[PDB]
Design a protein around this nucleic acid. Structure first.
Lengths: 493, 349, 184, 475, 500
RNA sequence: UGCGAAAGCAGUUGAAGACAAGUGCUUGUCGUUCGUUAAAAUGGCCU
């Protein structure tokens, strides 16, 4: 024997721009909600360790939002002027926040009332305050004083080591994964400067030019750093000290940048870049930085971040917007006597000599049109095909394979005006489209060649055939011109 | 020594069986797993296990065909729509009778069945039949080497059990009769040789709610024949109620009179009779109850008197779920809800 | 150097040149129901039933006598009419076969052994008409032979036995029918 | 163990084993050198086999029986050919035979000599000092069977023709199990529950050696000139001592040790090996009683060998006709399509008030909102002047976006048609420059070729619609 | 109704139609339980055990209108499961072989016979093959090279079949049709399933590519146009179910038959590409996009020749430099890098355009060195070291109209180390031709001048290919695959055999 | 039916015989023979 073949639903050849896989996943990220804020938010930082929370600054206010409840949790608001960068530590314990008066405070996250260690940096503002990732206890801060410092958070009376040699307004710095002692810095004059810190550090080990003012720098490997400023961005191979790539498909300047690896996705790695136009566009370094997906948040955008690679919960994508707006898009994730009476059911055969399963495994259920064509009632197959909410593919399927069985007249004998009419309405839509014009031509051709006199008798079928006439003429017009353009193009080639 | 001792079951024993020729035992439960033990006295070892996946068991039967004496099978069944047939050195030959032919609405589950021989009578060829209960009165009879439907007998009311008893006629001739007990008590006796036609019907006296009928004293589905010359007609009939009573008739006089008196009416157990087996030579009736602990009694027949000193207070029995009697060695093998079978020898044999 | 030979054979060649009778199968199960005998167009294969493989082939190409009988390529028309299991010349010595072709040849062969180059071949004479079927209860064997003088054939029914000599076949007329459209 | 007793025959081809079955013992013989349902049941449940011996003129075996009898059983016809009796009823502790003389130690501590061919109880005695008795061996004294050994817990040698005990060697603490004459002069006793075998001399009457075994001993077979001793160790193991009779050198350990083990590591217990010159034939019980054998060659076996058997411990039931899964091997399969990529054969991939500033922004980026609004603008003078003001490379990318949009929305084809037409008209020259025009403009090429394929059926159907409309319109 | 057969007791009856179900009627209540699909009409059914254990039943495979495709079945009775299925090699010839008719039905359609039509059509076929000399019985066979399994494309389904074991191993449906979902009976029998016309293996072994044309049912608006389909299938070497990995609708655009397929040599993409060649003349080149995971065009060549020729043959240089594309009366040599013809910059008569006398049936290359052309009248041999013709041979004696266009391509192939094989076919007569047949094979060396072998066959030969163990296999009418190549022991017997 | 491309272009529908129906007469049928390139019976797919 043989099992019965299921019907192959009719898949016509693909049209351009098909639902790409990456698009499937990133468009899962949905269910957006907005939060109004007091002022243009600046930096966002997901807590690394138990990644369920994220900090987001404001004017004079660092907020800790939650992740599983997407609401506020905690508020740090003891800052004199507006506060510029907030970032959790490696281990997750501490939050460091630098404000424009020129002082930083590191204090125990999820404990807003212990200003635990206040380090006074330069009297110029300190735009960037980050904790070292590889070590856990050196706070590398920046300033607007064109000089960045590595403080030790044990003793904060003197910058333990300093990095200088700037030109103008350092506002980005970063570290590198496999190297512990390399610090990368980005100013506003191109010129990423890579410092060793095992030497005096006053001079860079080497600089990487970037003609236009950089604004973010991310180590994305032990060997590549992505530099983000002005209209485009550029990724540098670091040992060989040369730029591999440069992608610039934005409009205004990019602002912020983030890179996340090894989350459950068809994309192994992703790099999301954010560009002050609503445009947050997401790229990937295993397909050579070709653009994959994009959201258009309304205003200009200052920051973006996706929740880290160890989220284990509903992941998030937040973007913080220059008129004071957060937009968040989140992807979610009897009797004891009775049992002792009937206690075998969960054995699954561990210590037995032979194991024999032959149970049939259940298919999915069959639709009504497949049931009628399993059991040969063609007339009700076609009537049960023309359903109100039924997929255009499915109506094309039953029309196709009923014709393939070669029972068009047979599927059509019994009919009258009312048993016909919904077919004509669908044939209107079918001739309107292009994948189905062949098959509906077959079906309406036989309706005519079989039912002309009834068509004389009733008045409403006249209405349908007049209207179908005008429709199909206008379809002559649309393939008509479409052949003329083939002439056009063939001359230009 | 305990028959399971070597490979302990994971659910209650539901149905035991001794092989009609060799020294084997078969056990099965909702554990889904047939286990065939070689039976010694000292050691009881595993010949074989088999785990039929996704399918329970609530009845196992060894089956040795009577003409061939090589067609040895095991039939197993649970609350499913199919029966498995394992035939009897390294991998298993198992079929599944699955399709009843015109008519399955009369049975949608295969869990209650028996096997028994039958003669064609136009040629003296003897084949299996498989008897299955059904929806309202229906017993469906299938041929057993090829799953075909033979004949179907409706008793009224609801069925509750059915036995088989054979009659001999001449050398080369027997005749099998199917006995079906309504749960109000009205016994119907069809015969199967000519198509299933009602020989008689008589009422069990008393008997408000009946579970379990069984015959004994001759050749049955619990001590079967091994060549046509050995088929013997069963002398005793027993009918066991779900109050607890068990009426006991003699076959000679019940067949003659066709609304007879029970020879003896036993009431010792107090819960619902769920097993009735006779001894293979037909002198002990063991009547047992699934429902409370330690409810086996062994009855000596013809005098219809319960043996008073075994089972005692300390007999480790538990909620007895199945019982067998051995064909030759005089062994008794009992299995309960913990899943442990225990084994005794009636030393007289 | 270069060798042309036959390796793989095909068709089973159902009993079609009948074009009349309604039991077209020739291939026969054993007595011990363990192996199936299929008469192929250029061999006979013995299939073990329970292991679903071919446990033996019997090639007319390898046997010198069988190629002389069947594969005389000018007339293929020697074609198997019936297979019978237990050997006819001996009452119950087994594993042998007697093969009946279209033109009254009976061949005594074996399987589960070795086809030693001496098949016991006997020929039925007396037949200007054609063998159609050979079939039997115990002892007495019956022969149908297609026959002619509407474009339809005639059937002749013969009784057949042995022991006269080792090559002698008793055939006696029993019945006949004139223009047969169907027969089963 | 389920096998109560066993013995090989001489020349090691047929094993006789006796085992119980619903409590009626049965004996049964098997081949081992490459079946037998020719069993022998005992009838009563009260007589048990107590000794076995083969004798080489059918092959027959002798069952010393618990009744007090000695059965002689031809193996071929399952027939107990003859039952000699002692005069009494006590369980025959031992049986031995050499030639034609059968001796049995009765549990009346008594010696019986029977004659086989004569079938007659010849003689009948008891001697002093042999207090209880358990085992017996009559010596190879040539042809004459004089001066045989019998053992209680302590061995003793007795002389027949004067029926007097001649010698006595220190036995064991437990009763002796095994007792064999290994050479002309040496013989081994070995005692039950002891891991020890003593090797005595007959004439000097002192221990030549002791052989230990790593666990308790259960059976013993020995090779030709005492060159090899294969001892079945009751843990289920097999020790062979190689050449135990030559020269710290009193207690010899065992040379080579053989275990048997299934694939998944489970131990399996050997019982009753048999040895000869370079050919050891071990045994084990495969299924619950059925015995399976194996030959192997121990001179070249390594020192500790774990011979392996495949034992279908948890395997998954495959049927021959059935597939890997559900299907059966006379099924054609089915046309499964699933997730194949289905595509055409023309896929030529891989082979004055304008808006031009907004348009060129959107096209250098990819702003579908912005392309949206600019394509929403519709009037054709605006269209033509805009496309003219555009830079031409960006107009190529305009064609790309336009084509994708037509194909996905073939109801937009009018306005997007005027866009693509005017674009082509104005910027034609750059397109003449570009080399791989088709490999760029696949999408436009694909869309237009599709509709151009479609035309003629539409025309034929238009004719047929005209036919019917004229037919009922004229009347 | 084609088979009726009782059980033994006479209470069950098995029935047997075109409708491929096998029906058991139980007679006491006229009830039944069939066996819905079976691969073909059942021409006999029977109950064979003692107690009705097995039903054997011979069934016809009637789709193939070119042979007699029986299949023996032995159904285990309890389970209704096939305890044995027995079969031969099943090719599809061009048109019908010697006096083989079709079964009987209600109507006479293009698949069966009415009664009247049965008698008449038997007369017709006998007369046709006596009279008209045009006849050919040429078939398509592929060899899976890693497995050396003969793949016979039966229509709409492949029959994987090795020949060492002779055990027909699989039968796979390769086109959505009505293949199993039904059994056709009358006007349903007048329907038609899409035909596997061509099948080729990449030299890798992991990929086959197949070409199969789709027919529409008659009397429609679109009862004129066929739709041709290419498909790319894969498998691991362990699995037996070929998987579909790319379905291509309409290669070369609408209504144009891909009438020559060439798998690629290993150099170009580790043998993962193919040429498809039309009848107008067009060429396309598909290969495996590996950053994606599927197949695509990579190189095209569309020449608008207004004319059609259904005889195109082609071959590929082993280094992959160039492509011989022989077409009607013509041969063009093409640069692989361009899909444009290779220009004679020497101008030393090493031209790329050889014009030959008749149509072109076959173009091959024994090495890089010799090219070999079979033309409708003659066999030509040219060497490409220096561009001169080497040898010619007369075939118009034997090849007149005896074959259709291209079937000589499937008659003759070449071993790719040593030599070449040619195949000739005759029918016998005394005084008008009979229906007997006889062929002869000839093996030539690479020079195409010396005959390394001249052998005879007593019945018609249909196809030759070279088994990759440097030998050749050839098929037949009578479906045989022929090869061209180079106290103790007395005691023993008893135990081994062992009313009142 | 032959050639051919997927187009299409060429070409073909003969006698005999017997039987049946109506009534020697009218028509038909064919498990018939020569001669050329020569719709139907309420009936549909297992678990």
């Amino acid at each position: 024997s043989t099992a019965r073949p299921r019907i192959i639903t009719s898949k016509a050849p693909l049209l351009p721009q098909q639902t790409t896989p990456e698009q499937r996943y990133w468009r899962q990220y949905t269910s957006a909600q907005l939060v109004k804020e007091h002022n243009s938010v600046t930096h966002i930082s997901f807590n690394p360790q138990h990644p369920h929370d994220f900090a987001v600054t404001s004017s004079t206010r660092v907020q800790i939002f939650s992740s599983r409840t997407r609401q506020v949790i905690k508020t740090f608001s003891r800052f004199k002027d507006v506060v510029y960068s907030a970032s959790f530590r490696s281990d997750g314990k501490l939050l460091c926040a630098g404000d424009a008066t020129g002082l930083v405070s590191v204090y125990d996250s999820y404990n807003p009332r212990t200003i635990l260690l206040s380090i006074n940096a330069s009297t110029h503002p300190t735009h960037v305050t980050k904790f070292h990732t590889q070590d856990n206890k050196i706070l590398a801060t920046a300033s607007d004083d064109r000089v960045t410092r590595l403080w030790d958070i044990s003793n904060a009376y003197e910058p333990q080591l300093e990095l200088t040699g700037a030109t103008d307004y350092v506002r980005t710095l970063s570290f590198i994964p496999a190297a512990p002692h390399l610090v990368a810095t980005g100013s506003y004059d191109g010129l990423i400067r890579l410092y060793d810190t095992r030497s005096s550090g006053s001079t860079p080990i080497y600089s990487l030019n970037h003609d236009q003012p950089v604004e973010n720098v991310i180590a994305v490997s032990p060997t590549q750093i992505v530099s983000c400023g002005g209209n485009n961005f550029k990724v540098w191979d670091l040992t060989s000290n040369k730029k591999l790539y440069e992608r610039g498909n934005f409009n205004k300047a990019v602002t912020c940048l983030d890179y996340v690896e090894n989350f459950d996705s068809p994309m192994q790695s992703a790099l999301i870049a954010s560009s002050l136009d609503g445009h947050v566009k997401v790229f990937d370094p295993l397909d050579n930085f070709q653009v994959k997906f994009g959201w258009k948040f309304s205003g200009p955008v200052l920051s973006c971040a996706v929740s880290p690679s160890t989220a284990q919960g509903n992941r998030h994508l937040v973007a913080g917007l220059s008129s004071g707006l957060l937009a968040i898009r989140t992807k979610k994730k009897k009797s004891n006597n009775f049992q002792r009476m009937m206690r075998g059911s969960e054995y699954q055969g561990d210590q037995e000599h032979i194991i024999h399963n032959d149970k049939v495994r259940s298919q999915r259920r069959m639709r009504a049109f497949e049931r009628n064509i399993n059991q040969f009632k063609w007339s009700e197959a076609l009537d049960n095909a023309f359903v109100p909410g039924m997929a255009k593919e499915l109506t094309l399927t039953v029309l196709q394979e009923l014709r393939k069985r070669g029972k068009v007249r047979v599927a059509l004998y019994g009919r009258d005006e009312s048993t016909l009419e919904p077919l004509l309405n669908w044939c209107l839509k079918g001739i309107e489209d292009v994948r189905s014009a062949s098959i509906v031509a077959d079906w309406v051709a036989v309706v005519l060649e079989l039912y002309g006199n009834t068509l004389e008798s009733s008045p409403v079928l006249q209405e349908l055939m007049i209207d179908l006439k005008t429709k199909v003429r206008h379809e002559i017009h649309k393939s008509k011109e479409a052949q003329r353009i083939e002439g056009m193009l063939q001359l230009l080639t | 020594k305990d028959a399971n001792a070597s490979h302990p079951s994971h659910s209650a024993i539901q149905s035991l069986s001794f092989h009609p020729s060799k020294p084997l035992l078969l056990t099965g439960g909702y554990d889904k797993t047939l286990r065939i033990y070689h039976i010694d006295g000292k050691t009881n070892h595993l010949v074989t296990s088999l785990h039929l996946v996704g399918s329970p068991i609530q009845t196992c039967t060894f089956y040795t065909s009577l003409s061939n004496q090589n067609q040895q099978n095991i039939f197993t069944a649970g609350r499913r729509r199919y029966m498995h047939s394992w035939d009897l050195s390294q991998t298993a030959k198992i079929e599944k009778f699955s399709r009843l032919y015109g008519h399955e609405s009369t049975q949608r589950s295969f869990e209650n069945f028996k096997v028994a021989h039958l003669q064609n009578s136009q040629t003296n060829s003897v084949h299996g039949i498989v008897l299955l209960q059904g929806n309202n009165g229906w017993i469906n009879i299938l041929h057993s080497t090829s799953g075909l439907w033979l004949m179907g007998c409706k008793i009224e009311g609801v069925i509750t059990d059915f036995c088989i008893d054979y009659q001999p006629i001449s050398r080369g001739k027997f005749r099998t009769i199917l006995i079906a007990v309504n749960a109000y008590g009205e016994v119907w006796e069809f015969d199967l040789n000519k198509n299933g036609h009602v020989i008689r019907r008589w009422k069990d006296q008393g008997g408000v709610g009946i579970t379990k009928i069984q015959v004994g004293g001759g050749t049955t589905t619990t001590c079967p024949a091994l060549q046509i010359s050995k088929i013997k007609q069963n002398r005793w009939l027993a009918v066991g109620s779900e109050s607890g009573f068990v009426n006991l008739y003699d076959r000679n006089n019940a067949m003659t009179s066709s609304t007879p008196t029970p020879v003896a009416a036993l009431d010792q157990l107090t819960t619902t009779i769920s097993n009735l087996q006779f001894s293979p030579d037909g002198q002990i009736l063991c009547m047992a109850s699934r429902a409370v602990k330690d409810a086996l009694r062994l009855v000596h027949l013809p005098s219809c008197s319960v043996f008073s000193n075994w089972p005692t207070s300390g007999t480790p029995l538990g909620k007895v779920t199945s019982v067998a009697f051995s064909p030759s060695g005089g062994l008794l093998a009992v299995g309960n809800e913990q899943g442990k079978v225990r084994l005794w020898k009636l030393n007289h044999y | 150097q270069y060798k042309l030979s036959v390796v793989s054979g095909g068709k089973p060649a159902l009993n079609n040149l009948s074009s009349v009778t309604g039991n077209k199968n020739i291939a026969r199960l054993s007595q011990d129901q363990r192996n199936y005998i299929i008469p192929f167009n250029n061999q006979i294969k013995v299939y073990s039933v329970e292991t679903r493989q071919c446990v033996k082939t019997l090639k007319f190409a390898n046997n010198s006598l069988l190629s002389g009988i069947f594969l005389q390529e000018e007339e293929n028309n020697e074609s198997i009419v019936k297979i019978l299991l237990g050997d006819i010349t001996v009452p119950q010595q087994a594993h042998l076969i007697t093969v009946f072709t279209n033109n009254g040849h009976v061949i005594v062969l074996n399987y589960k052994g070795k086809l030693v180059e001496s098949p016991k071949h006997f020929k039925i004479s007396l037949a200007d008409e054609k063998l159609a079927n050979v079939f039997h209860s115990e002892g007495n064997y019956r022969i149908l032979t297609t026959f002619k003088d509407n474009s339809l054939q005639s059937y002749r029914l013969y009784a057949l036995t042995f022991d006269d000599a080792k090559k002698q076949f008793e055939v006696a007329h029993q019945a006949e029918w004139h223009n047969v459209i169907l027969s089963n | 163990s389920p096998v109560l007793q066993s013995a090989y025959d001489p020349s090691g081809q047929y094993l006789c084993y006796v085992t119980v079955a619903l409590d009626k013992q049965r004996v049964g013989v098997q081949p081992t050198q490459r079946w037998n349902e020719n069993f022998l049941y005992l009838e009563d449940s009260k007589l048990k086999v107590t000794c076995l011996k083969w004798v080489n003129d059918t092959v027959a075996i002798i069952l010393g029986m618990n009744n007090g009898e000695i059965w002689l059983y031809s193996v071929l016809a399952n027939e107990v050919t003859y039952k000699f009796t002692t005069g009494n009823s006590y369980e025959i502790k031992d049986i031995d035979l050499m030639g034609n003389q059968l001796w049995c130690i009765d549990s009346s501590d008594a010696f019986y000599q029977f004659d086989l061919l004569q079938f007659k109880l010849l003689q009948h005695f008891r001697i002093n000092n042999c207090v209880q008795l358990n085992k017996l061996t009559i010596v190879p004294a040539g042809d004459s069977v004089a001066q045989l050994l019998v053992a209680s817990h302590s061995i003793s040698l007795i002389d027949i023709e004067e029926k007097k005990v001649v010698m006595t060697f220190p036995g064991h603490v437990s009763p002796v199990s095994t007792l064999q004459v290994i050479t002309n002069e040496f013989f081994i006793s070995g005692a039950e529950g002891d891991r020890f075998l003593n090797v005595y001399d007959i004439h000097s009457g002192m221990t030549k050696c002791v052989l230990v075994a790593e666990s308790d001993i259960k059976e013993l077979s020995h090779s030709g000139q005492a060159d090899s001793i294969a001892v079945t160790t009751e843990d289920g193991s097999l020790e062979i001592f190689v050449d135990p009779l030559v020269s710290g050198n009193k207690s010899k350990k065992s040379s080579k040790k053989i275990q048997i083990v299934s694939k998944d590591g489970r131990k399996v217990p050997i019982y009753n090996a048999f040895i000869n010159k370079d050919l050891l034939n071990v045994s084990w019980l495969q299924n619950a009683t059925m015995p399976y054998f194996k030959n192997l060659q121990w001179r070249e076996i390594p020192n500790e060998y774990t011979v392996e058997i495949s034992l279908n411990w948890n395997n998954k039931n495959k049927s021959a006709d059935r597939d890997l899964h559900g299907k059966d091997l006379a099924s054609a399969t089915n046309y499964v399509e699933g997730n194949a990529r289905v595509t055409s054969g023309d896929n030529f991939k891989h082979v004055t008030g304008t808006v031009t500033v907004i348009l060129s922004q959107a096209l250098q980026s990819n702003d579908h909102s912005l392309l949206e609004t600019v394509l929403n603008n519709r009037d054709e003078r605006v269209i033509r002047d805009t496309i003219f003001r555009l830079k031409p490379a960006l107009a190529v990318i305009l064609l790309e976006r336009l084509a994708e949009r037509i194909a996905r929305q073939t109801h937009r084809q009018g306005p997007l048609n005027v866009w693509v037409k005017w674009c082509l008209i104005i910027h034609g020259g750059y397109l003449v420059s570009i080399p791989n025009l088709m490999s760029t403009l696949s999408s436009l090429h694909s869309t237009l070729k599709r509709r151009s394929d479609l035309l003629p059926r539409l025309l034929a159907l238009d004719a047929r619609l005209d036919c019917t409309i004229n037919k009922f319109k004229t009347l | 109704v084609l088979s009726l057969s009782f059980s033994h007791d006479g209470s069950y009856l098995l029935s047997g139609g075109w409708e491929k179900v096998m029906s058991l009627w139980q007679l006491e209540t006229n009830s039944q339980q069939f066996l819905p699909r079976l691969n073909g009409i059942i021409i006999d059914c029977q109950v064979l055990g003692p107690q009705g254990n097995y039903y054997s039943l011979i069934l016809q495979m009637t789709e193939n209108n070119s042979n007699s495709d029986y299949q023996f079945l032995l159904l285990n009775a309890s389970d209704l499961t096939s305890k044995l299925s027995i079969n031969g090699p099943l090719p599809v010839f061009n048109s019908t072989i010697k006096h083989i008719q079709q079964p009987i039905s209600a109507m006479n359609t293009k698949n069966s016979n009415s009664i009247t039509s049965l008698n008449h059509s038997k007369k017709k076929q006998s007369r046709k093959l006596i009279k008209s000399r045009r006849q050919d019985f040429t078939t398509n066979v592929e060899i899976n090279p890693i497995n050396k399994n003969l793949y016979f494309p039966h229509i709409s389904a492949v029959q994987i079949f090795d020949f060492y074991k002779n055990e027909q191993v699989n039968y796979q449906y390769l086109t959505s049709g009505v293949n199993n979902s039904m059994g056709k009976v009358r006007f349903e029998l007048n329907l038609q399933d899409p035909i596997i016309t061509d099948l080729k293996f990449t030299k890798d072994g992991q990929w086959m590519i197949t070409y199969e044309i789709e027919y529409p049912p008659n009397d429609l608006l679109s009862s004129k146009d066929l739709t041709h389909i290419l498909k790319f299938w894969t498998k691991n070497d362990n699995e037996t179910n070929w998987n579909l990995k790319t379905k291509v609708i309409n290669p070369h655009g609408i209504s144009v038959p891909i009438t020559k397929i060439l798998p690629s040599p290993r150099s170009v993409n580790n043998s993962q590409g193919c040429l498809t060649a039309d009848n107008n003349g067009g060429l396309k080149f598909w290969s495996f996009d590996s950053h994606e995971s599927n197949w695509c065009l990579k190189k095209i060549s569309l020449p608008n020749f207004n004319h059609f020729s259904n005889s195109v043959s082609l071959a590929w240089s082993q280094d992959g430099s160039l492509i011989f594309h022989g077409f009607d009366d013509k041969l063009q040599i093409l640069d692989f890098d361009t899909f444009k013809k290779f220009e004679s910059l020497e101008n030393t008569k090493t031209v790329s355009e050889f014009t030959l006398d008749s149509e072109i049936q076959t173009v091959k290359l024994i090495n890089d060195t010799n090219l070999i052309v079979a033309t409708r009248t003659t066999l030509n041999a040219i060497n490409l070291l220096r561009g001169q013709v080497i040898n010619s041979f007369d075939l118009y004696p034997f090849v007149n109209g005896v074959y259709k266009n291209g079937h000589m391509d499937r008659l003759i192939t070449c071993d790719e180390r040593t030599g070449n094989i040619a195949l000739v076919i005759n029918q016998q007569l005394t005084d008008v031709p009979t229906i007997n047949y006889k062929s002869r094979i000839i093996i030539f060396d690479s020079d195409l001048s010396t005959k390394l072998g001249n052998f005879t066959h007593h019945e018609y030969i249909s196809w030759i290919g070279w088994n990759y163990d440097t030998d050749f296999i050839f098929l037949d009418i009578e479906s045989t695959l022929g090869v061209v190549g180079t106290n103790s022991d007395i005691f023993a017997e008893q135990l081994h055999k062992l009313n009142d």
